[PDB]
Design a binder for this molecule. Structure first.
Ligand code: CLA
Ligand code: CLA
Ligand code: CLA
Ligand code: CLA
Ligand code: CLA
Ligand code: CLA
Ligand code: CLA
Ligand code: CLA
Ligand SMILES: CC1=C(/C=C/C(C)=C/C=C/C(C)=C/C=C/C=C(C)/C=C/C=C(C)/C=C/C2=C(C)CCCC2(C)C)C(C)(C)CCC1
Ligand SMILES: CC1=C(/C=C/C(C)=C/C=C/C(C)=C/C=C/C=C(C)/C=C/C=C(C)/C=C/C2=C(C)CCCC2(C)C)C(C)(C)CCC1
Ligand SMILES: CC1=C(C/C=C(\C)CCC[C@H](C)CCC[C@H](C)CCCC(C)C)C(=O)c2ccccc2C1=O
Lengths: 32, 98, 192, 159, 80, 82, 733
């Protein structure tokens, strides 16, 4: 019986932000 | 019940013997005819694929027949495979009356 | 010559042994194909000629039907009984392995031949009596190819008669034809 | 029998359908005078339905679970009249029409103005060609073997 | 910025020049046909792409060809 | 029956409405080759319908299908409940 | 280069709104960009493929996270047959209170969406049990997507950029891809199954903490290296086994039972394990085929050259095809798309009849949705394969190098191919529509015994050859005397025959005249779509009407009104026309599947068996009958949970209708109308203060065709999806 903690949501959001930064870098490399 | 060591030994020995003595001329001249993967009339390494340079230190031979370690690996793999096929077929326990 | 008065194909002049100009489908138009077909006809025919005595003799002597001769395999046990005597090495796997290795070595040795005439007619160690030295090669080759074609047709008949009458051999079917010829023939299979 | 299909005469559901149709027709009939024209027309329809059901049952048709006839077209000897015989008749007729059309086109092709005969049909020549179509298979095989059926030098585009 | 090409199968009937709505084509002296003239396309910057010239050309296949390309305020036919 | 047939004709008009002439002309070229191979090509050369004719055929079959659908629907409903 | 289309000068210099549209529409076609070299093309493609992989993995991670956060995965796991899975929560400010009440399904505390993707069954079957497992998977997939993004950025750097010769190493790439990406991946999946998922279905709990100590078998790896491979199949699961518990659970890991698990009505897990293990072995062996740096193996060019029939019936054979395929990216893309479309259709056909996931085949809506989804994907993929093959003919084909080989000789008898395809299409169309209309007339006149009902005896014979004992053909597996039945009577045939003779599942459903007619309509659709696509591909380089089409590219509007008119003349237009036929064919297929399964699930198969032989039967008993609850989603008396599906139904009908406007009305009308609008704007007080930067123009001809087709396809898909989901969820039976 589990329900996902709030700190887990914080970790997921931070990881998503880092992945978005990486995607921005890749898109910039593709454009240039 | 089949002896694993005896079966694998016999099968691998038979395949190695076949490769070294029986089918060796056929393998040799067929691989000579199908020389190298070639693009636009030139090999990949000469076309400019640095990762595609053939390794010759791993192809040195001292057998009179020029038998190579990669040949050892191929025929031994076939031998292990045939031996395990025979072992599994013997121990299958499936004996259909045809 | 297979059909009187028929025109003969250009490539089949009539010099090869057993050449009667028979080629309705035009399969021998390609020369290399013709050479390969000559060698393959010789091999198939020699195998059939060497086979059919082993199809007839056991049935004549009993303990054999050339279809029940393979019955011991595909049966748990029975790895025995060559000629009414058990075979000490009759097991299926060893028989299969020995046959494969031996025939593979022999046939690969055959495949290593350059001269097409030597591909078809080796000579030497395969002619211990030197029959190929009596200046009768053409007639001997004609006799060989004729008996071989007859043997090929005979073995095809064996196979088809085994299909039509399961559990029977050739001599049994011959005795059936002789028992009542006018009501025991291929009409019972072609016309149900 | 074939594919678990029962004969129409033996089947129940065929007879049920016949009974239902006859009952509906008689229910319609109940509204009219016995000797009037609508009564005669309804009676004629009833007799036609009876004759149709009898013929279908006696002809040897297979019947499904729902009570309707099914057709067999795999070549069975007991059901040649379902597919093979009408197929042969259609093939004869269609070959006849196609062959006579081709013959008329070929005969018109060598004329003073082929297009005028293409829109305005030469009736006598058309009738002659049409009458000669009885033996079309023999003529078709004849031209196939004689090498006068196909062409070899035809217009094509840039390959 | 369309491109108009003339090929050496031209017979110099001048129909393409008469059909052009923007005066892109003109006739030029030539040798190689009975009329001894051929069509030219100097003002290709004014071509709109209507392909009337191609419709007016009598030849198995066209001696004048129009290849549509980059669009411009003149090619788009804009009055505003 | 006419309800279904009118839905059908209305659908059929869309193939004239949505398509162009060049495709059908090239397909007719291939079919004309097929008829030529057996010496049975017509004297009057087959041609695809013109652009204006394609539009006219499309609109005519479209209108016929739609109006016949409404006709069958109205008549059936009002004869049944009227 | 200066303006928005940085890759195109002609589009950059365009003063109209066409610049924006065409800059969007041609952005991802790298061969057409200005100053494009082969090396840059290959590297850009490689990085874009990395980006696509990252997007896919983020999509999966998002599914996992949203299900773990807002879904009742554990409650569903406790009672799989009585709980509705939850896809994602709803937060719509535009709702009213009745909608909030109506959308509170499951055990949720607010409005939610019920999932129809089947990921609950898939995740439950593979060992996932709690929400922490789903969260860990989501975080791991985030990490994987980050890794692919880093990989793309790195392999675009000047130090790490691969060379053109590296991208053309076909033998080495195929060797690694075949060995690793297939065989080793399936071997690892077998490892996961055996080591984790099979114990989960028997009441065990294996995770990363106890992976190193939990034996998959009581005697692990002893028999495997002793040659006693049969020890791992001694004790399979019992027929009374309860999935997820230890009641009647065996200890075998690689069985070969065949058939279905009685409680879950899905394939056995141990069967799936031996399957993926055998596939792994086969692929790992097949990898060691082509020559590389070690001096052994085949050479694909020599294989292609050697294969050439004597007598010249095939011409020069497959000679010269190696360079043609290696140097053409469109040839490779077409081959890949054709294979992927066939594989997707195979997945769709083989998943509804042999369900692999526990608790599936009881969730009817999920099964229908999965079938329709992957079948539409397959249709689009096939159409794309043919389109990119036509692009190959136009762009990469070199006539001189492909002199008299199979590829050129295909262009050689193209008229024969198109003619015989046209004949097949016409034959099927005439006689099939004739039979349907004849049956309609027979039933209209009240005489249903006069219709032409043809038994599909060939498919029934094949079904009897599989062991179905209903049609009384008694052949092959239906015959107890057959060699095949005797050979297989101990390995797989008990379970397979028990499954195939059951008439409640979807394994080889019974068929009749209606099934015959529908497979024939499907054949008509297939041959006609193939006709259109092949005609477009073969006539791409030129025809009699326009013998120099190859100079005008793949896509162009027309060739003017000369020579009789040349509308829809390019191969792109053949693609455009064939998309309609693809949609129609897939619609027929999905209609047939859905009606047959609705009748099967309701138990009333007689309605399909009787009403499918005529078209009024379809229109009355499928569409009109099953649209009731859909159209009653919201009414003047309130609203249900089907309100969203009713709204989507109307939305799809509307978008599909809107596509007709672009499809029927052409450009000149709109251009003149826009001219009048521009005059109006320039002459209006208080509006002259605002000026456009781009001169407004009407859409292009090809752009109009594309936009019409897009609105059309979106309407088609949304309408049928809404109808399917609503008509299957209102009853759940
Ligand atoms: C094409 C050549 C060929 C092949 C493949 C066979 C194969 C066979 N023969 Mg055979 N045979 C052949 C030619 C051939 N024969 C000829 C030419 C003769 C005449 C001399 C015979 C006479 C013969 C007899 C008399 C018998 C067989 C038997 C057999 C079977 C037992 C094999 C065995 O244990 O022998 C290997 C033994 C020692 C090496 C086997 C199927 C036996 C059989 O089927 O009995 C059931 C048997 O009794 N054969
Ligand atoms: C090589 C020549 C040859 C010879 C001498 C025979 C001889 C015989 N065949 Mg035979 N047969 C042959 C070739 C030959 N066959 C071939 C090539 C085929 C394949 C088409 C067959 C297929 C065949 C069938 C199917 C049957 C015979 C039968 C027979 C027997 C009765 C004669 C008859 O009906 O015909 C007789 C022993 C019949 C038999 O034995 O029934 C009593 C019979 O039913 N044969
Ligand atoms: C590829 C499909 C195909 C084709 C071309 C034919 C062709 C033919 N069948 Mg046929 N048939 C087929 C499938 C087919 N069959 C199947 C699947 C069955 C069910 C087992 C049958 C059952 C069948 C029967 C029972 C008979 C034929 C017969 C015939 C012949 C008349 C003709 C050569 C007839 C025939 O050859 O008579 C000897 C005949 O009586 N067929
Ligand atoms: C063993 C080493 C190895 C491995 C693992 C890979 C793996 C890969 N390479 Mg590759 N490559 C290799 C060696 C290798 N390569 C070598 C040596 C070279 C140079 C000669 C290259 C050159 C190369 C290029 C140039 C490109 C790749 C690309 C790719 C990727 C293809 C896209 C993808 O994920 O498909 C995944 C495919 C599968 C998993 C196969 C599945 C089989 C079918 C489709 C489905 C069956 C599964 C089952 C039925 C469904 C279950 C699903 C579930 C929902 C139930 C893939 C990750 C491409 C890429 O994307 O770049 C990043 C690319 O452009 N490679
Ligand atoms: C890639 C897939 C994979 C991986 C990583 C593992 C990993 C593991 N398995 Mg496992 N397993 C797998 C597939 C896999 N398995 C499959 C498909 C089966 C079914 C046949 C099994 C059956 C199985 C049993 C029955 C047992 C394990 C055990 C183990 C553990 C110890 C392995 C061991 O004894 O040393 C490996 C020893 C070796 C001699 C192997 C090295 C040489 C191999 C053959 C190389 C393979 C070829 C290579 C790719 C090149 C380890 C966690 C044991 C354990 O203690 O688990 C807790 C155990 O009892 N597994
Ligand atoms: C692996 C899948 C795949 C890949 C990599 C490509 C890649 C490509 N396709 Mg293709 N295509 C595919 C699947 C694929 N396609 C499928 C499934 C279809 C059928 C729907 C098509 C139909 C298709 C057509 C009809 C055309 C392309 C074109 C193109 C090229 C440019 C695309 C473009 O301009 O985007 C722009 C994207 C949009 C405007 C998005 C609109 C929504 C590019 C090489 C074009 C081309 O090469 O022109 C010559 C072109 O005309 N493709
Ligand atoms: C449901 C309406 C409908 C119907 C009945 C047809 C019927 C036909 N179309 Mg068509 N089509 C339609 C809608 C329809 N189309 C739409 C909306 C489009 C999108 C623009 C197309 C696009 C299209 C193309 C691109 C092609 C066809 C072709 C065909 C013919 C196929 C041969 C056949 O089945 O003969 C059956 C005969 C009849 C039904 C006539 C009954 C009297 C046939 C005349 C193909 C063709 O001509 O093949 C030779 C072809 O190439 N159509
Ligand atoms: C049934 C589908 C359909 C629809 C909706 C339209 C819509 C339209 N057509 Mg049209 N057309 C169609 C089919 C359709 N067509 C077909 C099949 C043909 C072929 C015969 C034509 C032929 C045609 C011609 C020849 C002409 C039109 C014209 C018009 C316009 C009418 C005037 C206007 O602005 O309406 C206003 C109303 C609407 C646009 C619909 C209501 C607005 C909806 C509800 C949405 C608005 C809010 C929206 C949510 C905004 C938020 C967006 C945001 C979320 C992104 C309008 C754009 C005429 C035109 O140009 O107008 C001057 C015109 O001359 N059409
Ligand atoms: C020097 C010399 C000598 C000797 C030699 C020798 C001794 C050799 C050996 C060799 C060998 C001895 C080899 C081997 C090899 C092997 C191998 C290479 C193997 C492989 C395997 C595999 C690959 C497997 C796989 C698998 C698995 C894993 C699982 C199950 C399935 C299978 C089976 C598939 C002499 C005296 C003659 C003299 C001269 C010199
Ligand atoms: C135009 C073009 C193109 C395209 C093409 C295409 C798109 C195609 C397609 C095609 C296809 C799409 C095909 C398909 C096929 C399939 C097949 C051919 C299959 C087969 C199968 C079989 C044969 C099976 C068998 C069996 C059975 C029945 C049972 C079980 C067992 C077995 C398995 C044996 C390209 C790119 C090349 C380029 C050039 C141009
Ligand atoms: C289908 C279609 C065609 C093809 C249709 C054609 C060629 C019309 C065919 C009409 C009939 C079927 C011709 C009949 C010929 C004779 C009258 C037959 C006489 C013999 C008996 C049948 C009476 C176009 O040409 C076309 C052109 C422009 C836009 C759209 C389309 C379009 O959609």
């Amino acid at each position: 019986m589990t329900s996902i903690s709030d700190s887990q949501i914080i970790v997921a959001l931070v990881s998503a932000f880092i992945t978005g930064i990486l995607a921005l870098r890749l898109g910039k490399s593709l454009y240039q | 019940e089949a002896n694993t060591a005896l079966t694998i030994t016999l099968s691998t020995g038979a395949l190695l013997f076949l490769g070294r003595f029986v089918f060796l001329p056929f393998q040799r001249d067929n691989v000579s005819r199908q020389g190298l993967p070639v693009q636009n009339g030139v090999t990949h390494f000469d076309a400019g694929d640095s990762r595609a340079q053939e390794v010759t230190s791993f192809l040195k031979t001292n057998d009179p027949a020029g038998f190579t370690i990669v040949d050892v690996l191929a025929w031994g793999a076939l031998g292990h495979a045939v031996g395990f096929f025979i072992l599994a077929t013997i121990n299958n326990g499936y004996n259909p009356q045809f | 010559e297979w059909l009187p008065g028929n025109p003969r194909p250009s490539y089949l002049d009539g010099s090869a042994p057993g050449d009667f100009g028979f080629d309705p489908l035009g399969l021998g138009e390609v020369p290399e194909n013709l050479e390969r077909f000559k060698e393959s006809e010789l091999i198939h025919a020699r195998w059939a000629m060497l086979a059919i005595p082993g199809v007839l003799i056991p049935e004549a002597l009993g303990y054999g039907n050339w279809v029940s001769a393979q019955k011991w395999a595909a049966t748990p046990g029975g790895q025995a009984t060559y000629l009414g005597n058990p075979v000490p090495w009759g097991n299926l796997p060893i028989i299969l392995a020995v046959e494969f290795i031996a025939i593979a070595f022999v046939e690969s040795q055959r495949n290593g031949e350059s001269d097409p005439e030597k591909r078809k007619y080796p000579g030497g160690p395969f002619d211990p009596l030197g029959f190929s030295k009596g200046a009768n090669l053409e007639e001997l080759k004609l006799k060989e190819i004729k008996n071989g074609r007859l043997a090929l047709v005979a073995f095809l008949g064996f196979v088809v008669q085994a299909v039509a009458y399961p559990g029977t051999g050739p001599l049994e079917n011959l005795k059936t034809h002789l028992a009542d010829p006018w009501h025991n023939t291929i009409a019972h299979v072609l016309i149900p | 029998d074939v594919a678990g299909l029962t004969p129409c005469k033996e089947s129940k559901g065929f007879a049920k359908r016949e009974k239902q149709e006859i009952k509906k027709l008689e229910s319609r009939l109940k509204l009219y005078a016995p000797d009037s024209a609508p009564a005669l027309a309804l009676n004629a329809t009833i007799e036609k339905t009876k004759r149709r059901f009898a013929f279908y049952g006696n002809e040897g048709l297979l019947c499904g679970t729902d009570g309707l006839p099914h057709l067999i077209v795999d070549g069975d000897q007991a059901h040649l009249g379902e597919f093979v015989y009408p197929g042969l008749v259609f093939l004869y007729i269609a070959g006849w029409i196609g062959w006579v059309g081709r013959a008329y086109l070929i005969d018109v092709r060598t004329s003073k103005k082929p297009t005028e005969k293409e829109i305005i049909i030469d009736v006598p020549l058309a009738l002659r060609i049409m009458s000669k179509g009885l033996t079309w298979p023999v003529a078709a095989i004849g031209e196939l073997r004689s090498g006068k059926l196909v062409e070899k030098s035809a217009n094509i585009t840039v390959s | 910025a369309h491109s108009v090409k003339i090929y050496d199968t031209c017979i110099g009937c001048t129909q393409c020049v008469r059909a052009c709505p923007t005066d892109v084509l003109e006739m030029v002296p030539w040798d190689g046909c009975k009329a001894s003239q051929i069509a030219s396309a100097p003002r290709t910057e004014d071509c709109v792409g209507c392909k009337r010239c191609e419709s007016a050309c009598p030849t198995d296949f066209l001696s004048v060809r129009v290849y549509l390309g980059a669009e411009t305020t003149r090619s788009m036919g804009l009055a505003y | 029956l006419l309800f279904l047939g009118a839905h059908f004709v209305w659908a059929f008009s869309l193939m004239f409405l949505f398509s162009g002439r060049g495709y059908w002309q090239e397909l007719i070229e291939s079919i004309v080759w097929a008829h030529n191979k057996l010496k049975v090509a017509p004297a009057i050369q087959p041609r695809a319908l013109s652009i204006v004719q394609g539009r006219a055929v499309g609109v005519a079959h479209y209108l016929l299908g739609g109006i016949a659908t409404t006709w069958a629907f109205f008549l059936a409903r009002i004869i049944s409940v009227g | 280069a200066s303006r928005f289309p940085k890759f195109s000068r002609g589009l950059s210099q365009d003063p109209t709104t066409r610049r924006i549209w065409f800059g969007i529409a041609t952005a991802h076609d790298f061969e057409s960009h200005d100053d494009m070299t082969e090396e840059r093309l290959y590297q850009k493609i490689f990085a874009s493929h990395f980006g696509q992989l990252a997007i896919i993995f983020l999509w999966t991670s998002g599914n996992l996270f949203h299900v773990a956060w807002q879904g009742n995965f554990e409650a569903w796991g406790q009672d799989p047959l009585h709980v509705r899975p939850i896809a994602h929560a709803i937060w719509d400010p535009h709702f009213g209170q009745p909608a909030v009440e109506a959308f509170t399904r499951g055990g949720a505390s607010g409005p939610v969406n019920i999932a129809y993707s089947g990921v609950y069954q898939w995740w439950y079957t593979i060992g996932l049990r709690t929400n922490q497992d789903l969260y860990g998977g989501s975080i791991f997939l985030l990490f994987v997507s980050a890794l692919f993004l880093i990989a793309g950025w790195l392999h675009l750097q000047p130090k790490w950029k691969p060379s053109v010769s590296w991208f053309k190493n076909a033998e080495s790439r195929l060797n690694h891809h075949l060995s690793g990406l297939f065989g080793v991946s399936s071997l690892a999946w077998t490892g996961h199954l055996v080591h984790v998922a099979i114990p989960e279905s028997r009441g065990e709990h294996v995770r990363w903490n106890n992976l190193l100590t939990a034996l998959p078998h009581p005697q692990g790896l002893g028999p495997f290296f002793a040659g006693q491979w049969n020890v791992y199949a001694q004790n399979p699961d019992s027929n009374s086994h309860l999935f997820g518990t230890s009641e009647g659970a065996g200890t075998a890991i690689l069985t070969f039972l065949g058939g279905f698990h009685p409680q879950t009505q899905s394939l056995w897990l141990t069967d799936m394990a031996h399957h993926h293990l055998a596939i792994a072995v086969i692929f790992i062996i097949a990898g060691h085929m082509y020559r590389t740096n070690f001096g052994i193996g085949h050479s694909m060019k020599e294989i292609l050259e050697a294969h050439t029939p004597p007598g010249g019936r095939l011409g020069r054979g497959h000679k010269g095809l190696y360079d043609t395929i290696n140097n053409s990216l469109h040839f490779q893309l077409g081959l890949a798309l054709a294979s992927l479309g066939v594989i997707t259709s195979l997945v769709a056909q083989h998943m509804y009849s042999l369900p692999p996931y526990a608790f599936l085949a009881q969730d009817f809506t999920t099964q229908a949705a999965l079938y329709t989804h992957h079948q539409y994907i397959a249709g689009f993929i096939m159409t794309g394969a043919f389109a990119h093959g036509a692009i190959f003919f136009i762009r990469d084909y070199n006539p001189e190098q492909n002199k008299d080989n199979v590829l050129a000789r295909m262009l050689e008898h193209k008229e024969a191919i198109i003619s015989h395809l046209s004949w097949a299409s016409l034959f099927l169309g005439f006689h099939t529509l004739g039979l349907y209309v004849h049956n309609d007339v027979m039933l209209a006149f009240g005489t249903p015994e006069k219709q032409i009902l043809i038994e599909p005896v060939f498919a029934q014979w094949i079904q009897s050859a599989h062991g179905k004992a209903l049609y009384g053909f008694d052949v092959l597996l239906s015959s107890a005397d057959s060699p095949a039945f005797n050979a297989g009577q101990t390995l797989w045939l008990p379970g397979w025959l028990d499954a195939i003779n059951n008439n409640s599942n979807s394994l080889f459903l019974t068929i009749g005249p209606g099934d015959f007619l529908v497979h024939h309509a499907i054949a008509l659709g297939l041959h006609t779509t193939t006709l259109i696509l092949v005609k477009g591909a073969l006539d791409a380089r030129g025809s009699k009407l326009m013998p120099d089409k190859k100079e005008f590219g793949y896509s162009f509007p027309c060739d003017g009104p000369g020579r009789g008119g040349t509308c829809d003349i390019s191969a792109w237009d053949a693609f455009y026309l064939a998309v309609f036929w693809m949609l129609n064919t897939i619609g027929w297929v999905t209609f047939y599947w859905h009606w047959k399964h609705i009748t099967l699930w309701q138990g009333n198969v007689a309605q399909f068996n009787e009403s499918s032989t005529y078209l009024m039967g379809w229109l009355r008993d499928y569409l009109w009958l099953n649209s009731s609850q859909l159209i009653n989603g919201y009414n003047p008396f309130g609203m249900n949970s089907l309100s969203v599906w009713a709204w989507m139904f109307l939305f799809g009908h509307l978008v599909w209708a809107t596509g007709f406007m672009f499809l029927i009305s052409w450009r000149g009308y709109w251009q003149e109308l826009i001219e009048t609008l521009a005059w109006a704007h320039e002459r209006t007080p208080l509006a002259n203060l605002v000026r456009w930067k781009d001169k407004p123009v009407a859409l292009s001809i090809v752009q109009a065709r594309l936009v019409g087709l897009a609105h059309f396809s979106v309407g088609y898909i949304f309408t049928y999806a809404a109808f399917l989901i609503a008509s299957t969820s209102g009853k759940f039976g």
